[PDB]
Amino acid sequence: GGYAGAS
Amino acid sequence: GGYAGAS
Amino acid sequence: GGYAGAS
Amino acid sequence: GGYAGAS
Amino acid sequence: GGYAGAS
Amino acid sequence: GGYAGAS
Amino acid sequence: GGYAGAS
Amino acid sequence: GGYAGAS
Amino acid sequence: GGYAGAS
Amino acid sequence: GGYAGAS
Amino acid sequence: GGYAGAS
Amino acid sequence: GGYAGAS
């Protein structure tokens, strides 16, 4: 499983 | 901003 | 399962 | 944000 | 079984 | 089993 | 940030 | 900034 | 089993 | 598993 | 920063 | 700056 975020 | 993920 | 959000 | 999981 | 949520 | 979260 | 894992 | 990862 | 996190 | 971040 | 590991 | 790694 995984994830990615950007702000 | 944004977020995504899965498993 | 998964998800994505953006603001 | 988000969450996912399973078994 | 499993689940996913996003807010 | 597994999981993934992102905030 | 994010987290993922499984067994 | 951003973050990503997986397992 | 394993894991990964990023902040 | 792995990760990458940038600010 | 980030962390990962497994066994 | 940035960081990356894996195992």
Author numbering:
A (entry chain A), B (entry chain B), C (entry chain A), D (entry chain B), E (entry chain A), F (entry chain A), ...: 52 to 58
Quote the study that presented this structure, word for word.
Although other intermediate filament proteins have been demonstrated to form amyloids, KRT8 specifically has not previously been characterized as an amyloid-forming protein. This protein, like other alpha-keratin proteins, contains a central coiled-coil domain that is flanked by an amino-terminal head domain and a carboxy-terminal tail domain, which are both low complexity in sequence composition. KRT8 is known to aggregate pathologically, primarily in the form of MDBs in liver disease. Atomic structures of KRT8 LARKS reveal that pathogenic mutations convert the non-pleated wild-type protein into a pleated conformation, shedding light on the molecular mechanisms underlying aggregation-promoting mutations in low-complexity proteins.
